[PDB]
Design a protein around this ligand. Structure first.
Ligand code: MET
Ligand SMILES: [Mn+2]
Ligand SMILES: [Mn+2]
Length: 295
């Protein structure tokens, strides 16, 4: 339950994130970018907490390339790089928004500053809604809209989403009190849209949740793999594309999802297709202050 492991993951995450920004150049194939980042995490002695998310513009999050993905980077693209690393279950969840081949603009500044704002107020004994207020005001005061159905979350060993959120808006009932030992991921999301995300195809990220009886053999076999190799952490569709043909893989996945054996994470898009910016850091709450493990 190490602060070292948490910190180690934190520094690793940072390293691969900063590099990801330099590679995020126009003409860069999303697929290549992804496998470079993930490859860099292991070379550093870490493990992906989840497949690196690469979301462009209106696409808010939960997008990761796949084998055969032709999606390529171009100048002006508001690319959100959400990197996740874990050391023996100790996670580090961070992200940045880079507008390919250009500089940071207002929208991006809103999300970033929102983050900085939230972090500066984060202290043991402080109610989560305080962070929310801080975040919302940094985004709105800049004329943008926070995304209401996407927020930070408490993080625990081998558990990305611990069950306590940090909304990007102020809510009178978010009265949970930050305490020493708590690990949270603060990820303010800002957009020029309505400020709400929706589910849309395809489904490129999944996660094991429950071991349930499965009739079909191939599906049953896959479930066992997912469980054994990906445990209780999200995995990418891409990571399994070398296991079996496309047709069979999709069916298997589809079945397991149906049986309620695994969770499917469809790509999230702004409800008005408004460009979306996101900045995220992981923090550890201590007695006198918080520690941003990923800055
Ligand atoms: C679906 S994998 C992406 C997880 C995302 N980084 C989050 O903060 O929840
Ligand atoms: Mn993230
Ligand atoms: Mn997160």
């Amino acid at each position: 339950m190490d602060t070292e492991k948490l910190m180690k993951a934190g520094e690793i995450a940072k390293k691969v994130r900063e590099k990801a920004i330099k590679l995020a150049r126009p003409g860069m194939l999303l697929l290549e970018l992804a496998e470079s980042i993930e490859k860099m995490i292991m070379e550093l002695g870490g493990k992906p907490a989840f497949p690196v998310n690469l979301s462009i513009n209106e696409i808010a999050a939960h997008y990761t390339p796949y084998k055969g993905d032709t999606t390529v980077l171009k100048e002006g693209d508001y690319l959100k790089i959400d990197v996740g690393v874990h050391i023996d279950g100790f996670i580090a969840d961070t992200a940045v928004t880079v507008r390919v081949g250009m500089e940071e603009d207002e929208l991006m500044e809103a999300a970033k500053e929102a983050l900085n704002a939230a972090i500066s107020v984060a202290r043991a004994g402080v109610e989560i809604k305080e962070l929310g207020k801080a975040i919302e005001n940094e985004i709105r005061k800049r004329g943008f809209k926070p995304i209401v159905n996407l927020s930070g979350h408490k993080i625990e060993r081998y558990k990305l989403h611990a069950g306590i959120s940090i909304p990007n808006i102020y809510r009178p009932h978010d009265n949970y009190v930050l305490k020493e030992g708590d690990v949270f991921a603060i990820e303010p999301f800002a957009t020029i849209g309505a400020g709400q995300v929706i589910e849309v195809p395809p489904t490129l990220i999944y996660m094991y949740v429950r071991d349930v009886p499965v009739r079909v053999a191939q599906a049953r076999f896959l479930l066992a793999k997912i469980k054994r190799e990906y445990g209780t952490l999200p995995f990418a569709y891409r990571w399994l594309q070398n296991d079996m043909p496309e047709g069979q893989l999709k069916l298997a996945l589809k079945t397991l999802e149906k049986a309620g054996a695994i969770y499917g994470y469809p790509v999230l898009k702004e409800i008005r297709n408004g460009i979306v910016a996101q900045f995220e850091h992981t923090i550890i709450v201590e007695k006198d202050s918080v520690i941003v493990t990923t800055e």
